Amino acid sequence: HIKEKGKPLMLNPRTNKGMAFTLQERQMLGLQGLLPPKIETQDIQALRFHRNLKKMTSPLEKYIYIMGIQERNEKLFYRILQDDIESLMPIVYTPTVGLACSQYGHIFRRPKGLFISISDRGHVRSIVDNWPENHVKAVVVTDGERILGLGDLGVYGMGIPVGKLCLYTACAGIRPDRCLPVCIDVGTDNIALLKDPFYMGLYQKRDRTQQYDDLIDEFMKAITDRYGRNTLIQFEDFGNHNAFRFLRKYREKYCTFNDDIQGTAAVALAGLLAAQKVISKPISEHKILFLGAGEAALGIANLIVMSMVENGLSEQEAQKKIWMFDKYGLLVKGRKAKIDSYQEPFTHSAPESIPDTFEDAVNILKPSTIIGVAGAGRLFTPDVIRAMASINERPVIFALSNPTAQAECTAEEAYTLTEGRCLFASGSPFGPVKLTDGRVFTPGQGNNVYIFPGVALAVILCNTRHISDSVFLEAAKALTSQLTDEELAQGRLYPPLANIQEVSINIAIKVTEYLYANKMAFRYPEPEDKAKYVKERTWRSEYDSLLPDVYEWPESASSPPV
Amino acid sequence: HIKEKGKPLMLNPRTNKGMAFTLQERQMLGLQGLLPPKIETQDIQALRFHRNLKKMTSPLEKYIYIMGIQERNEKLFYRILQDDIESLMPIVYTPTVGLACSQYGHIFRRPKGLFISISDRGHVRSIVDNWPENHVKAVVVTDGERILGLGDLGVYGMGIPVGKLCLYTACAGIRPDRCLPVCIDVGTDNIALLKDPFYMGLYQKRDRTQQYDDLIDEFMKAITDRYGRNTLIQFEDFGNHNAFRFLRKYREKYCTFNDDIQGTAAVALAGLLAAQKVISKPISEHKILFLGAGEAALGIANLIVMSMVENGLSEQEAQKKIWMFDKYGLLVKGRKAKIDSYQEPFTHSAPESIPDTFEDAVNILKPSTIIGVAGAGRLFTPDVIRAMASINERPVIFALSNPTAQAECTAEEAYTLTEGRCLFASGSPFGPVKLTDGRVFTPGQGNNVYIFPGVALAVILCNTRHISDSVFLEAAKALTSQLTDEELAQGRLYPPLANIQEVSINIAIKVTEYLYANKMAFRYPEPEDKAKYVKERTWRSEYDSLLPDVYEWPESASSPPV
Amino acid sequence: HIKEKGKPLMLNPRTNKGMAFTLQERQMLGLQGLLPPKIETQDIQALRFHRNLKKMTSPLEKYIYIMGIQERNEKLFYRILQDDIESLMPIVYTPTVGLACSQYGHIFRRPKGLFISISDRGHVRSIVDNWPENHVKAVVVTDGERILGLGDLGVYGMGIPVGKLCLYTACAGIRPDRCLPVCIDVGTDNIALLKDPFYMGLYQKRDRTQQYDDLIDEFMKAITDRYGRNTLIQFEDFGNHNAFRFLRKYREKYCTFNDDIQGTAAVALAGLLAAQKVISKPISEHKILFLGAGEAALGIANLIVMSMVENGLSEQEAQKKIWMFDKYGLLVKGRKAKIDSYQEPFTHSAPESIPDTFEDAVNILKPSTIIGVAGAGRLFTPDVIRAMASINERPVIFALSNPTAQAECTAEEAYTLTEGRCLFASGSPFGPVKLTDGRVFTPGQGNNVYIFPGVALAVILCNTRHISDSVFLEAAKALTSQLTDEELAQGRLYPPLANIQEVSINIAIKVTEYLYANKMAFRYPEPEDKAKYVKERTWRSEYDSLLPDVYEWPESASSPPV
Ligand SMILES: NC(=O)c1ccc[n+]([C@@H]2O[C@H](COP(=O)([O-])OP(=O)(O)OC[C@H]3O[C@@H](n4cnc5c(N)ncnc54)[C@H](O)[C@@H]3O)[C@@H](O)[C@H]2O)c1
Ligand SMILES: NC(=O)c1ccc[n+]([C@@H]2O[C@H](COP(=O)([O-])OP(=O)(O)OC[C@H]3O[C@@H](n4cnc5c(N)ncnc54)[C@H](O)[C@@H]3O)[C@@H](O)[C@H]2O)c1
């Protein structure tokens, strides 16, 4: 049921088609004369915008162009996004979305998403009621505090949820109606933004008192009051500590998951399973040394332990295979540095040497896998890579810190200081590495877009209210299952991004099959086959006919005379 | 979220308040000057319309007035309807709605409901898409073929679903948004309507070919395609044969129930349980003789047998206690008249006398309960009542045929030809009976409004897709449980209509508790207590504040100079 | 009366304010949360967009930016346009609008204006009825056939009326509601546009049959049928012959004027009056030699003759002072080349030498003023300029052909081959000229924006139905009257563009005072002072308060009890 006609129909991106309005539905809907005479298809529109896009050279001009397309016509926007997804995820999402936020601030002409300020505390529900859309299933919330590679940006961080929500629809098929980007702005610590008179938000510094926590609680309550307790809420580019503690707080009472703790863990585990298929030995035979003992490292280690346990190994024996190296030093029993409750499982009896630097820890533990999530910088020194290559026939090196400037090492050093026998994976993109021997090795990129769209779609479709830790184990197994035998022969650890739209759906299916198996899905009746269930509820970018049904009634009896 | 402002806000019955618009929300919403200066409450509005209504004397003038109120303001309409519900159900619903349809045709100024003609076959889905409301949970469908007491009325029967849907909201609390009245018009057999030039529908006779069945199938498919497979669809005032066979056809694949077969059975069973509490002996000790062997009689008998079985009695022993008397004669094994499959359970070894008339059957079977659902007329002859009073100390007489002109007997003859020891219940309303002895006996009225609102609410809230036969057994038990000890002492078989709005809710709770117990509810998580679950989802007729939230921001830092 | 609320209010450029929405009218209108928290004024918005605009370097990027601003917020767009009008007329209008049309085709996201194709013939009125705005006073029509400096562009020429209509509001103050840009597309002769599959119009060549004339007549009739007989209609960038003959055809029955024939004539006459104030001798003492005998030359000559006549000189004596030099040769009586009716007034008895080239004509006629409107190219050869400087103490040279590539000469040659005593004026912009002597001469630019906004405003305000030839004489006198004594001392022939918004208004006043004096104004009662009349009806770009009037009623008597 479309209730619009004429010019309003073309001012709504949801119902706009541009020139794809056929002649008969131009004439019946009152659009004749308001559009140029040509009748086009969506293929022609997509081709026009694709070549206009190839003519452009900077990523940021491409970003402005493609978001303008999103604002004028959303079906065409998502068709263009799905057509060339590998080349446009770096544009629509990180890293270009952060540059767009930093430099052009708020490009958008239309109001996309809510702005909730600390000045609105006690009245968040009215702000949420101002949003026209009545059914939203996914909410992405930003603080602006930690933009990836840009730092604090305040209100300008609003472009980060928007872009991310695009991926929700471009890869998973979540309806754009059902997505709400939110910016919780509590001030900014960026003095550059506090000095200029054209900053678009509060001119105070970040509120770090109890008012911030109360505002977050009130916003969560308002969102789930209007939209339901099973609304998926993601905290995107919050402060690191804030994001971690909010994930702990709202994990049980709300449907939230984190990409930094849970998505990164799932992607790292998928890479590890791919590596265990590439190399002869399984994941249980590995010995993992972590660089960093934060909550992202703990999430990855817990997921690895769950994977080890499900393969027949005991929990304690699994945890004895993971070693974690803090900034202070190796986590061992009896060290003078403070160790909290969550690092207790991975605190082990100290080795004889008691290493003080990371390279010494690599030499003394002889670990097969090395995983860097510290985020400090180039902590994977060349000596570390050389020691890894010497100890292991085929070392597994994971530099999961992002952006590139914060990665533990780059693919070039990893693949050169080794003879190419290392299985290197990184969060940040890297170019293929060519050696003097003549071979070319492409490093697997642990993109978070592998996990969160499929998991979000499965959670939204199944009416899940609590996203557990084993959902991401199932997602990691599903992601690994997408790799073919020839891909493993070529040494790829992840499926190519070019078919993410397929991979995501497959992931969703597996997660769906898990959620109904573990009674964490509240959408009944339970579908007989989950694949056909999820594949008919994804959003299609094909235009819908707006043509009124005009037909002739069969002739009936004549009306009687008066 | 209200998206309207100014005059449109007062032209929508859903958002209109009339003078209950407070001054501040008159000024903020642009209604100042468009309303008379007085500020009123809903109590004052209800009082004004109540006395204007008492001034009126004919039921039909009252009907026109109250439907005008519904068209201008729906919250006030339902508040007035709930305030005096016992006196306004006869006005909003049968019998006055049939008189309104017959005489004033289509009173309504607003479009309420869909008109689907046989001329629209093959294009029903477009008609359904023309309905603005996106979520409807209850659909009431009429043919116009059998209006209760009026006969065929064609398109003019459209007023029957409308009125019935009012009860859905007045007693059960179903949202008026979620209700859709439909008229399937396939012509009329009423020659008076075929002769006048101002009849509002097709001027053909009723289509009784396969096109009618195909149209009904297409309409069912279109409704459940747009609104979901668990949409509740009720066929109201269809032809008797058509309604029965459509109930059989769509019982399994759609969420449908019938008031004539299932609601009448539930009400009769509730009366029988009340009578078993009034008299010493239980329902199993009774011997039931039915007048009529149709599908309504079979539904009542099957529900009675289920009730007998659940109380410890065997199924065959239960069915041996019900005797059914057809027009041809008593259903016995070996009679020359044809007996179909559904009457096989209640076909018994013939008694010695083999009675040929109904009064002889009463004399020879000595039945404690007598139930008339034949619909022929005054078949409960005075000799039948006298025989019942002589055989039984306290006979139970049920004249469930309606309207009054088709009832098997009236309360006056039943209570006079007996000394007042009969427990008489009838579908049609009757006045209290006073005898020369001085006592006054009020006959229990088996109103269908007891069952269908509560059952409809429980089915809608639980996302049920198939309404079984034991749902109505649970509803009958719930209805009987509403009677207090003093009410049973006074001889009432049904709770008073004056608190139907309460009774219905209680019925809903029980049905809800049944549906979750038998895994026929698909709304999860399952509520811990069903009473609080259903009582917070019913529709309240209290006005909602439209006042925008206006507040002052706390003072923050000054904007920097340029 | 604003009937919108919430998000629609910000999706309408007419009512959108962006952050200029005050807090109280954010909260009352349902915009809270949909806008960033900052409250801004229009000054802050204008400053932000001004510096964002200075950061840009190419004119075309500036065009895209400023038209995006127009699409999101029109009051801010016109405030920015009026703030820096001298630097943004070259961007909003020619020459940058033609480059935008050629290269980016149709930038616009919103539907601005109507597209009427030859395929819609016989149904133009329905297309006109599709336009939402009910009162439009000015219509600018384009063919796309002759874009200034770009040639045929077909449908892509639609950007030319749009830009021109901006000037209508930026200089004159005509309401943007009242403006309708139209593109009559009858095919294109541009083979580049006929080859590519992404051209936005008909893929046929230009229809030059009677169907084109019939389409133009039908469009004129439809526009004046919907909007009134006094609707101002301007044919913009039509074919040269088509524009001239359409001006002749519709001059009497419609309210049309032409910028090429009438605006150019008015601007040239204003320059000539300024020159007659700069030099001692008046316009009657001059002898004018024209280069070109087209209809633009004839319009300029007729306006010059009218100006000469109104100063006491006879008509025949006035026409004997203008000489016109065709491509074939000097217009003289008895030449073998064909001379039509309109060149008869300026065909004179041949001089003795009978010159064959233009330089010889300059030598033999000794003309004080030289005016080039041929449009061929650099026909003002250096010998012509040298002869002009030798014959006249202060020659007047007018190179009114545009663009620069078609100008008869450039300011540098004109001011250098003379010692700086020439009064050079050109249609196309030129840079200031510096000589070795050290002086700097700025050439007066005969911009058409001097005349058409003020004349259009005066015609629209006075309800004029026929724009005569003396309206432009009055406009030329008004334009000349804007020059101060010091400006004439410095040698300027036209008022600076930086205050066009003022000059236009003054022109309007004079034209208004003329129209009421000659009974060509149909808006009555006639205003006592025309200045205050026109200055209170111009459109102001200041934001209008949307705040609902909220107040407290004085306490009155209490409502009585029931
Ligand atoms: N033209 C339209 O706007 C249009 C047309 C048809 C249906 N719908 C919508 O379809 C919905 C029907 O719901 P259902 O019974 O199929 O739910 P469902 O049982 O199939 O799935 C369960 C939950 O998942 C949600 N969901 C389903 N698909 C989704 C998707 N691609 N993206 C995000 N969320 C999704 C659903 O809203 C629902 O809450 C209606 O709410 C209706 O508004 C809209
Ligand atoms: N101003 C408004 O219009 C407004 C305000 C609040 C909520 N709502 C509506 O509330 C609904 C929320 O659904 P829910 O999660 O509470 O479903 P639910 O889980 O509580 O109940 C299950 C089913 O029963 C339906 N239902 C619930 N109450 C009903 C009633 N009184 N009458 C008829 N049907 C009823 C529901 O639509 C749902 O399909 C939204 O669809 C939303 O449109 C509307």
Ligand SMILES: NC(=O)c1ccc[n+]([C@@H]2O[C@H](COP(=O)([O-])OP(=O)(O)OC[C@H]3O[C@@H](n4cnc5c(N)ncnc54)[C@H](O)[C@@H]3O)[C@@H](O)[C@H]2O)c1
């Ligand atoms: N919020 C609004 O939209 C709003 C508010 C106030 C007035 N108006 C408009 O003002 C108009 C009143 O007309 P009037 O009696 O003052 O005419 P008028 O007598 O003052 O002028 C005569 C003609 O010139 C037109 N005109 C006047 N000013 C114009 C301008 N700046 N630009 C273009 N055309 C102009 C007029 O529409 C009229 O047709 C109403 O049509 C009404 O729609 C609109």
